[PDB]
Amino acid sequence: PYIVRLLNSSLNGCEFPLLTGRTLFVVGQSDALTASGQLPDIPADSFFIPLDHGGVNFEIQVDTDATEIILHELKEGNSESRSVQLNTPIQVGELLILIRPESEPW
Amino acid sequence: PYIVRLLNSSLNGCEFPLLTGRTLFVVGQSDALTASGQLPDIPADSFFIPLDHGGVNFEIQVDTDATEIILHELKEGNSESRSVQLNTPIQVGELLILIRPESEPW
Amino acid sequence: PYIVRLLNSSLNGCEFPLLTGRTLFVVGQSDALTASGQLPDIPADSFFIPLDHGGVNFEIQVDTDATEIILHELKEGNSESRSVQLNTPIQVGELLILIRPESEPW
Amino acid sequence: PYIVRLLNSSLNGCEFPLLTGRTLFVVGQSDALTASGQLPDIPADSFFIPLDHGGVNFEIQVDTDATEIILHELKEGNSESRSVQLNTPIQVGELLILIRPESEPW
Amino acid sequence: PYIVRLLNSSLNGCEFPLLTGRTLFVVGQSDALTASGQLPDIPADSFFIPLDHGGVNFEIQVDTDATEIILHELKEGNSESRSVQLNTPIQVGELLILIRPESEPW
Amino acid sequence: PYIVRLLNSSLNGCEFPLLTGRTLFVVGQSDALTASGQLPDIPADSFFIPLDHGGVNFEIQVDTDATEIILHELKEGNSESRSVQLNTPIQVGELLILIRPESEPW
Ligand SMILES: [Ca+2]
């Protein structure tokens, strides 16, 4: 399985496990956080990341096979889907992340 | 069953599952959120969505069959009903949502 | 069992179940909400409803028989009681509510 | 047993059970509330209330017999005690309370 | 066993049970409270007390025998200890507390 | 088993267990705290420590053997690693910490 690590933001170093399928990252200010509590405590498929400026929500999708990883950047009324590589910094809005095999520490 | 997906707001991407019968969405600023905690932690039939402008509460009704979905936009002392289709954006106040089957991600 | 539905306020559409005996609704601004957390998480007999203007605290009494429903507005150092009809809008200060049987959606 | 009812404030109508022995009421602004969560969820013996001005904490002691009720107002490094009666408004700081038998609503 | 009673602060009159061994009191503003939730819900060996100014964290140590009581005031990278007597106001920073036997009400 | 004790900050005195493997400490202001709630309630591998100035996120890795302890400071786009000792004050940015065997109180 794969892990998303933050390489910047006040949560730099935080590591989030990804489930097979879709994981949502909500990225933004106060208004989003306190409301994100709306989602149940089910095995976490959405996470909130605080960022004061330039935050863009995104999903990561890990195919059932774990052979392709797709990042869906969620813009106004549309999304931009990109193929992404492991163990490399990936910029999403003003956030910088890395996706690593669980067994390969960064 | 069906899932309500936000297509704008700070929570763009967030997905809320619908139960048979009735689910309420409270859409608005700070005053509503902190108070929405008043409702018990029972299987979630009301959700809060932050929106800084143009938020209008609405409830979705799904029949026992799960073949018809009606949205009721809640105005002052009254409501306005509309039939909805799956997989199509729906504008309620300034919020844009889409209703999808669980099995067809969007 | 009866349900109180809000017909206005930022919480328009919210529905609160009524227990036999007494249910209190505290209606007002920010100061009341954050402090209403003082009351335990026991089966809910008190609710907070935000209203920027004209909010009047009230309690509702359901007799053991469920044949009469009494509403008390909690004014300064006094209260004003009245019988209320089911399935009809009821104004309390500037809040508008409706009490319905759990079996009759509005 | 007995019930403490608030007869004024934004929280007019709130009812709290008095326990056998000693019950403490913490009265004041935001700073006290969020911190009152420090106390465990044991059968409630301290309770918080909000009051914008003149909030004085107080404790009520009830004898084994339930015939005497002593209220202690908690001032700086000292307390001022008085015997109180049932079903009679009692002023404590800016707050007006009333202590009633459970079986006798106000 | 022994109880810590607050003799000032917004929580004046609050009484915290002490366990044999070391109990931590974190005393300060908002930043500490919300983060104190980090500590597990194990039998409470930690308490948060709100104080807007002059708050100092401290530990109370009750030897296994319950014959000596030591307060450790926490400073930068070090602590300063003193023996404390029962039933007398103890100043820690701007907080005022009193340690009593459970059987001797203050 | 090893324990991290804070020797400064508003949480001076708080202690955090270290798990075998990796533990992250997020050290900063308000924005990080409220959002750190994003991480699940799984056996705690990240913790948040408030510090108004000079906070540096850092992670500690305890080898499977429990014979070496390595602390990594998480700077901008990079990390800095060093061996650290038990039972001695360790400066990490402006935080002061100490790591002890659980069996040896401090
Ligand atoms: Ca007596």
XYZ file of C-alpha atoms and ligand atoms in Angstrom:
637
model
C 0.000 0.000 0.000
C 0.936 3.650 -0.414
C 1.318 6.610 1.934
C 1.024 10.310 1.126
C 3.638 12.516 2.926
C 3.432 16.296 3.188
C 6.667 17.972 2.329
C 5.520 21.480 3.252
C 2.687 23.235 5.102
C 2.415 23.473 8.889
C 1.826 19.673 8.774
C 5.135 18.997 6.921
C 6.105 15.385 7.660
C 2.532 14.121 8.173
C 1.954 10.725 6.511
C -1.571 9.608 5.417
C -2.414 6.102 4.433
C -4.161 5.605 1.214
C -6.922 3.083 0.685
C -7.467 1.238 -2.513
C -9.822 3.446 -4.529
C -10.233 7.202 -3.795
C -8.881 9.341 -0.961
C -9.885 12.980 -0.661
C -7.588 15.803 0.597
C -9.384 18.961 1.579
C -6.823 21.797 1.634
C -7.702 25.264 2.921
C -8.528 27.566 5.855
C -10.655 27.368 9.089
C -14.131 27.175 7.471
C -13.369 23.739 5.936
C -11.759 22.109 9.027
C -14.518 22.553 11.626
C -17.080 21.385 9.039
C -15.021 18.364 7.877
C -16.124 16.749 11.168
C -19.402 16.142 9.274
C -17.905 13.072 7.656
C -18.189 9.872 9.732
C -15.280 8.170 11.552
C -15.333 5.300 8.975
C -11.912 4.087 7.778
C -10.526 7.460 6.711
C -11.161 8.256 3.025
C -10.955 12.071 3.473
C -8.382 14.268 5.220
C -8.182 17.989 6.005
C -4.894 19.833 5.472
C -4.626 23.425 6.661
C -2.936 25.872 4.299
C -3.453 29.631 4.612
C -3.037 30.360 0.867
C -3.167 28.509 -2.464
C -4.833 25.285 -1.201
C -6.506 23.080 -3.849
C -8.643 20.001 -2.938
C -7.480 16.769 -4.625
C -8.215 13.021 -4.732
C -5.703 10.291 -5.141
C -6.854 7.099 -6.744
C -5.011 3.910 -6.388
C -6.196 1.289 -8.807
C -7.113 -2.059 -7.336
C -3.867 -3.501 -8.725
C -1.699 -0.732 -7.180
C 0.101 -0.279 -10.573
C -1.111 3.226 -11.526
C -1.614 6.331 -9.325
C -3.816 9.160 -10.520
C -4.110 12.577 -8.921
C -7.362 14.458 -9.579
C -6.927 18.126 -8.879
C -10.346 19.603 -8.049
C -10.717 23.116 -9.729
C -13.818 25.277 -10.294
C -16.532 23.063 -11.828
C -13.881 20.750 -13.322
C -10.969 18.491 -12.396
C -7.517 17.949 -13.863
C -6.448 14.358 -13.718
C -2.769 13.478 -13.834
C -0.665 10.445 -13.758
C 1.912 10.692 -10.896
C 5.186 8.984 -9.996
C 6.182 7.541 -6.618
C 8.941 8.990 -4.448
C 8.881 12.350 -6.178
C 7.721 15.774 -5.050
C 4.333 16.612 -6.556
C 2.936 20.093 -6.390
C -0.819 20.589 -5.910
C -1.711 24.225 -5.614
C 0.693 25.486 -2.985
C 0.978 22.095 -1.358
C 3.908 19.771 -1.945
C 3.409 16.031 -1.413
C 5.144 12.743 -2.047
C 3.605 9.286 -2.469
C 5.786 6.418 -1.265
C 5.407 2.659 -0.948
C 4.715 1.949 2.713
C 8.013 -0.005 2.831
C 10.246 2.797 1.454
C 10.761 5.471 4.115
C 11.353 9.106 3.074
C -27.804 3.894 -2.801
C -26.824 7.401 -3.854
C -24.112 9.824 -2.916
C -24.256 13.621 -2.907
C -20.927 15.101 -4.248
C -20.033 18.750 -3.851
C -18.715 20.311 -7.042
C -17.797 23.710 -5.519
C -17.341 25.328 -2.058
C -14.297 24.851 0.230
C -15.349 21.215 0.447
C -15.365 20.646 -3.345
C -15.095 16.821 -3.669
C -16.718 15.883 -0.444
C -19.255 13.083 -0.703
C -22.195 12.443 1.613
C -24.183 9.246 1.473
C -27.992 9.382 1.241
C -30.351 7.208 3.261
C -33.745 6.164 2.093
C -36.166 8.855 3.117
C -34.735 12.171 3.920
C -31.402 13.874 4.226
C -31.004 17.531 5.136
C -28.173 19.777 4.111
C -27.642 22.995 6.078
C -25.630 25.387 3.969
C -24.251 28.643 5.312
C -21.740 30.514 7.522
C -20.192 30.011 11.041
C -23.386 30.485 13.127
C -24.986 27.309 11.715
C -21.930 24.983 12.027
C -21.113 25.291 15.726
C -24.826 24.906 16.510
C -25.346 21.928 14.170
C -23.533 19.907 16.864
C -26.933 20.021 18.625
C -28.140 17.110 16.519
C -27.237 13.659 17.903
C -24.575 11.333 16.431
C -27.334 8.981 15.112
C -26.791 7.602 11.577
C -26.252 10.932 9.797
C -29.456 12.435 8.337
C -28.264 16.160 8.491
C -24.992 17.641 7.240
C -23.571 21.107 7.303
C -21.824 22.656 4.290
C -19.933 25.932 4.677
C -20.537 28.567 2.068
C -19.683 32.247 2.602
C -22.469 33.543 0.307
C -25.717 32.347 -1.246
C -26.195 29.143 0.841
C -29.784 27.722 0.924
C -30.776 24.670 3.045
C -32.185 21.717 1.094
C -33.347 18.208 1.771
C -33.211 15.186 -0.542
C -35.883 12.560 -0.512
C -35.271 9.101 -2.052
C -38.255 6.769 -2.405
C -38.303 3.264 -0.935
C -37.504 1.945 -4.375
C -34.551 4.257 -4.894
C -35.910 5.216 -8.368
C -36.906 8.810 -7.702
C -34.952 11.508 -5.956
C -36.658 14.824 -5.092
C -34.790 17.878 -3.817
C -36.673 20.419 -1.708
C -35.047 23.800 -1.484
C -35.983 25.379 1.829
C -36.991 29.011 1.580
C -38.707 31.209 4.170
C -41.664 29.249 5.603
C -41.986 27.230 2.358
C -40.143 24.864 0.037
C -39.686 24.444 -3.698
C -39.411 20.899 -5.050
C -37.553 19.735 -8.119
C -37.002 16.314 -9.618
C -33.357 15.504 -10.136
C -31.314 13.349 -12.423
C -28.249 11.411 -11.573
C -24.793 12.475 -12.717
C -25.777 15.996 -13.508
C -24.835 19.177 -11.790
C -27.542 20.740 -9.648
C -27.390 24.311 -8.413
C -28.941 25.048 -5.003
C -28.416 28.675 -4.042
C -24.696 29.114 -4.783
C -23.799 25.537 -4.129
C -23.305 23.086 -6.979
C -23.895 19.384 -6.244
C -24.208 16.196 -8.214
C -26.007 12.970 -7.146
C -24.387 9.731 -8.323
C -24.929 6.087 -7.757
C -22.484 4.646 -5.221
C -21.077 2.422 -7.971
C -20.371 5.135 -10.598
C -17.584 7.383 -9.210
C -17.415 10.974 -10.500
C -43.674 10.870 19.152
C -43.778 14.449 17.828
C -41.085 16.352 15.993
C -40.384 20.102 16.038
C -39.328 21.381 12.559
C -37.819 24.783 12.010
C -39.383 26.791 9.204
C -36.903 29.672 9.271
C -33.442 30.574 10.741
C -30.063 29.401 9.457
C -31.255 25.905 10.625
C -34.388 25.934 8.468
C -35.501 22.282 7.937
C -33.887 20.924 11.071
C -36.083 18.518 12.959
C -35.925 17.814 16.661
C -37.660 14.868 18.287
C -39.805 15.664 21.361
C -39.655 13.547 24.476
C -42.577 13.033 26.787
C -42.428 15.819 29.322
C -40.290 18.839 28.722
C -38.055 19.987 25.867
C -36.281 23.313 25.960
C -35.206 25.417 23.005
C -32.733 28.193 23.741
C -32.951 30.673 20.913
C -30.373 33.403 20.382
C -26.826 34.506 19.408
C -23.224 33.117 19.874
C -22.973 33.563 23.673
C -25.689 30.933 24.322
C -24.421 28.239 21.867
C -20.853 27.721 23.069
C -22.133 27.609 26.644
C -25.054 25.232 25.899
C -22.355 22.527 25.739
C -22.586 22.696 29.555
C -25.603 20.429 29.504
C -24.783 16.691 29.444
C -25.195 14.406 26.403
C -28.211 12.697 28.091
C -31.191 11.998 25.812
C -31.628 15.523 24.432
C -34.121 17.617 26.410
C -32.472 21.018 25.453
C -31.546 22.492 22.047
C -29.789 25.673 20.898
C -31.181 27.556 17.878
C -29.217 30.517 16.549
C -31.245 33.579 15.621
C -29.673 37.002 15.188
C -32.804 38.927 16.245
C -36.083 38.368 18.065
C -35.186 35.011 19.641
C -37.268 33.934 22.609
C -36.484 30.852 24.678
C -39.270 28.324 24.898
C -40.203 24.961 26.280
C -42.667 22.381 25.004
C -44.645 19.954 27.157
C -46.056 16.653 25.763
C -48.532 15.091 28.260
C -48.034 11.421 29.067
C -51.052 10.600 26.916
C -49.771 12.605 23.908
C -53.238 14.276 23.565
C -52.340 17.890 24.493
C -49.204 19.981 23.524
C -48.332 23.098 25.506
C -45.844 25.785 24.568
C -44.304 28.202 27.098
C -42.390 31.289 26.021
C -39.789 32.230 28.520
C -39.907 36.013 28.732
C -38.186 38.196 31.361
C -38.970 36.744 34.817
C -42.256 35.268 33.531
C -43.721 32.883 30.975
C -46.715 32.870 28.667
C -48.330 29.501 27.970
C -50.557 28.349 25.127
C -52.004 25.275 23.504
C -50.669 24.685 19.967
C -51.955 22.942 16.885
C -50.069 20.178 15.089
C -49.077 20.626 11.432
C -49.367 24.370 11.614
C -46.786 27.133 11.589
C -46.232 28.596 15.073
C -44.309 31.805 15.594
C -42.206 32.208 18.791
C -40.535 35.528 18.885
C -39.185 35.637 15.339
C -38.619 31.930 15.006
C -41.100 29.887 13.058
C -41.652 26.245 13.945
C -44.060 23.435 13.193
C -44.874 20.422 15.377
C -45.750 17.272 13.505
C -46.423 13.636 14.254
C -43.324 11.585 13.441
C -45.666 9.685 11.046
C -46.669 12.780 8.922
C -43.819 14.398 6.978
C -44.319 18.074 6.278
C -34.463 15.180 44.363
C -34.272 18.807 43.367
C -33.692 20.687 40.147
C -31.954 24.032 39.696
C -33.718 26.212 37.068
C -32.279 29.411 35.528
C -34.913 32.145 35.546
C -32.939 34.779 33.599
C -29.933 35.110 31.257
C -29.746 34.014 27.581
C -30.063 30.530 29.127
C -33.410 31.196 30.857
C -35.190 27.834 31.339
C -32.137 25.576 31.602
C -32.571 22.911 34.304
C -29.828 21.034 36.096
C -30.290 18.178 38.595
C -28.823 18.919 42.133
C -26.981 15.916 43.426
C -27.086 14.660 46.996
C -24.236 16.387 48.760
C -22.407 19.082 46.788
C -22.996 20.464 43.245
C -20.777 23.188 41.747
C -21.913 25.620 39.116
C -19.221 27.321 37.087
C -20.607 30.579 35.634
C -18.843 32.916 33.131
C -17.478 33.546 29.635
C -15.746 31.421 26.907
C -12.461 30.747 28.761
C -14.213 28.637 31.439
C -16.423 26.531 29.074
C -13.836 24.997 26.751
C -11.687 24.176 29.793
C -14.552 22.717 31.865
C -14.231 19.681 29.562
C -11.267 18.835 31.819
C -13.613 17.312 34.364
C -14.501 13.647 33.705
C -17.896 12.410 32.437
C -18.667 10.942 35.913
C -22.221 11.501 37.180
C -22.356 15.286 36.761
C -21.294 17.195 39.953
C -19.874 20.288 38.397
C -21.936 21.964 35.642
C -20.983 25.179 33.591
C -23.350 28.061 32.766
C -22.654 31.220 30.459
C -23.263 34.753 31.774
C -21.890 37.863 30.080
C -21.639 39.907 33.309
C -21.501 39.373 37.067
C -20.858 35.632 36.942
C -19.923 34.193 40.245
C -19.389 30.503 40.673
C -21.474 28.885 43.403
C -21.942 25.532 45.031
C -25.030 24.103 46.629
C -24.987 21.680 49.497
C -28.039 19.495 50.354
C -28.202 17.495 53.536
C -28.998 13.795 53.656
C -32.552 14.632 54.632
C -33.031 17.142 51.786
C -34.460 19.687 54.303
C -31.627 22.219 54.152
C -30.075 23.693 51.103
C -26.987 25.842 51.572
C -25.721 27.945 48.704
C -22.117 29.158 48.862
C -21.162 32.042 46.519
C -17.521 31.665 45.566
C -15.693 35.057 45.944
C -11.938 35.764 46.031
C -10.314 33.362 48.524
C -13.538 33.190 50.560
C -17.245 32.225 50.325
C -20.542 33.675 51.523
C -23.214 31.096 52.502
C -26.999 31.252 52.845
C -29.819 28.887 53.465
C -32.274 28.818 50.574
C -35.840 27.656 50.147
C -37.656 25.854 47.394
C -39.728 27.454 44.694
C -38.378 30.947 45.381
C -36.169 32.994 43.104
C -32.595 33.278 44.377
C -30.187 35.862 43.123
C -26.573 34.761 42.684
C -24.448 37.460 41.026
C -26.349 38.531 37.865
C -28.051 35.110 37.706
C -31.532 34.314 39.033
C -32.149 30.696 39.906
C -34.899 28.660 41.424
C -34.693 25.231 43.160
C -37.711 22.996 42.756
C -38.756 19.475 43.511
C -38.350 17.298 40.401
C -42.145 16.468 40.592
C -43.218 20.176 40.597
C -42.452 22.111 37.414
C -42.108 25.826 37.541
C -6.678 10.482 49.546
C -6.470 14.135 48.652
C -8.258 16.692 46.518
C -7.006 19.815 44.825
C -9.413 22.693 45.124
C -9.078 25.864 43.044
C -9.485 29.026 45.112
C -9.361 31.424 42.160
C -9.559 31.345 38.315
C -12.765 30.969 36.274
C -12.926 27.431 37.693
C -12.898 28.651 41.358
C -14.367 25.920 43.535
C -13.487 23.009 41.126
C -12.117 20.007 43.004
C -9.801 17.510 41.366
C -8.988 14.136 42.910
C -5.333 13.323 43.208
C -3.974 9.867 42.552
C -1.068 8.369 44.388
C 1.968 9.440 42.444
C 2.243 12.436 40.075
C -0.632 14.580 38.807
C 0.002 17.283 36.150
C -1.829 20.569 36.026
C -1.449 22.524 32.792
C -2.422 26.117 33.485
C -2.759 28.681 30.719
C -4.565 30.010 27.667
C -6.412 28.495 24.630
C -3.370 27.000 22.874
C -2.818 24.487 25.715
C -6.480 23.371 26.175
C -7.284 22.195 22.649
C -3.962 20.374 22.512
C -4.334 18.740 25.937
C -6.861 16.411 24.258
C -3.727 14.637 22.948
C -3.410 12.784 26.248
C -5.456 9.565 26.471
C -8.647 9.130 28.525
C -6.730 6.886 31.017
C -7.492 7.490 34.714
C -6.827 11.239 34.780
C -3.218 12.069 35.813
C -3.497 15.420 33.943
C -5.834 18.463 34.202
C -6.132 21.710 32.250
C -6.969 24.889 34.129
C -7.654 28.113 32.153
C -5.871 31.249 33.342
C -5.460 34.312 31.102
C -2.241 35.517 32.808
C 0.560 34.189 35.018
C -0.237 30.487 34.571
C 2.522 28.047 35.501
C 2.273 24.218 34.997
C 2.845 22.138 38.041
C 2.867 18.563 39.389
C 1.547 17.348 42.661
C 3.290 14.292 44.079
C 1.597 12.191 46.801
C 4.032 9.541 48.124
C 2.740 5.981 48.275
C 2.302 6.361 52.028
C 0.314 9.626 51.731
C 2.544 11.208 54.458
C 4.412 13.856 52.394
C 3.119 16.254 49.657
C 5.421 17.812 47.102
C 4.562 20.405 44.512
C 6.856 20.624 41.481
C 6.615 23.960 39.713
C 7.639 23.559 36.047
C 10.075 26.156 34.627
C 12.204 26.266 31.441
C 14.006 22.913 31.184
C 13.891 22.386 34.966
C 11.526 22.098 37.905
C 11.522 23.540 41.453
C 10.056 21.577 44.248
C 8.532 22.524 47.620
C 6.703 20.759 50.440
C 3.136 21.905 50.842
C 0.789 21.828 53.777
C -2.802 20.714 53.743
C -5.660 23.184 54.064
C -3.778 26.295 53.191
C -3.699 28.489 50.117
C -0.760 27.601 47.878
C 0.221 30.132 45.231
C 1.494 28.665 41.901
C 2.210 31.442 39.479
C -1.075 33.479 39.601
C -3.133 30.407 40.455
C -4.320 29.801 44.006
C -5.074 26.225 45.113
C -5.674 24.363 48.267
C -4.964 20.615 48.899
C -7.341 18.908 51.396
C -8.198 15.408 52.616
C -11.330 14.187 50.930
C -12.989 13.909 54.359
C -12.293 17.592 55.286
C -14.433 19.983 53.184
C -13.055 23.542 52.707
C 9.452 1.715 25.875
C 10.393 5.393 25.676
C 8.603 8.637 26.598
C 9.024 12.245 25.361
C 8.615 14.880 28.057
C 8.304 18.549 27.249
C 10.527 20.762 29.333
C 9.065 24.037 27.989
C 6.049 25.258 25.885
C 2.539 25.843 27.320
C 2.437 21.999 27.598
C 5.599 21.890 29.852
C 5.362 18.576 31.717
C 3.278 16.677 29.203
C 4.556 13.338 28.241
C 4.059 11.449 24.949
C 4.724 7.773 24.392
C 7.089 6.800 21.645
C 6.129 3.827 19.544
C 8.680 1.543 17.963
C 9.336 3.022 14.555
C 8.418 6.637 13.757
C 6.767 9.337 15.857
C 6.043 12.834 14.461
C 5.740 16.009 16.440
C 4.079 18.925 14.656
C 5.173 22.067 16.381
C 3.522 25.415 15.616
C 0.545 27.838 15.981
C -3.319 27.556 15.791
C -3.624 26.680 12.085
C -1.874 23.303 12.567
C -3.780 22.176 15.729
C -7.395 22.371 14.576
C -6.389 20.616 11.350
C -4.311 17.897 13.046
C -7.691 16.376 13.992
C -7.628 15.099 10.397
C -5.453 12.202 11.428
C -7.379 9.172 12.739
C -7.514 8.097 16.409
C -5.251 5.064 15.629
C -2.494 4.337 18.185
C -0.938 7.823 18.253
C 1.995 8.250 15.804
C 1.694 12.087 15.377
C 1.294 14.698 18.042
C 0.779 18.393 17.963
C 2.692 20.777 20.312
C 1.751 24.430 20.275
C 4.588 26.950 20.220
C 4.064 30.560 19.170
C 7.614 30.986 17.772
C 10.532 28.925 16.544
C 8.665 25.599 16.260
C 10.242 22.911 14.010
C 8.445 19.693 13.082
C 10.541 16.749 13.902
C 10.277 12.992 13.906
C 11.932 10.420 16.140
C 12.817 6.920 15.082
C 13.519 4.228 17.638
C 15.177 1.175 16.103
C 13.595 -2.256 16.510
C 16.265 -3.095 19.079
C 15.649 0.091 21.146
C 19.459 0.747 21.227
C 19.676 3.898 19.064
C 17.468 6.996 18.866
C 17.554 9.267 15.855
C 15.817 12.584 15.646
C 15.073 14.190 12.269
C 14.316 17.903 12.107
C 11.977 18.663 9.190
C 13.087 21.848 7.541
C 12.071 23.331 4.179
C 12.268 20.579 1.541
C 14.947 18.758 3.574
C 15.663 17.080 6.910
C 18.562 17.062 9.348
C 19.396 13.933 11.342
C 21.169 13.253 14.656
C 21.625 10.770 17.375
C 20.042 11.796 20.669
C 20.575 10.677 24.283
C 18.215 9.554 27.016
C 17.556 11.462 30.153
C 18.996 14.773 28.895
C 17.450 18.050 27.609
C 17.345 18.128 23.790
C 16.734 21.426 21.968
C 14.624 21.182 18.765
C 14.175 24.647 17.329
C 12.780 26.531 20.404
C 11.209 23.447 21.991
C 12.975 21.652 24.817
C 12.338 17.937 25.225
C 13.683 14.932 27.046
C 13.393 11.254 26.201
C 13.232 8.745 29.121
C 12.718 5.051 29.555
C 9.196 4.635 30.776
C 10.538 2.867 33.894
C 12.643 5.954 34.898
C 10.492 8.930 35.895
C 11.535 12.514 35.438
Ca -32.229 17.805 57.770
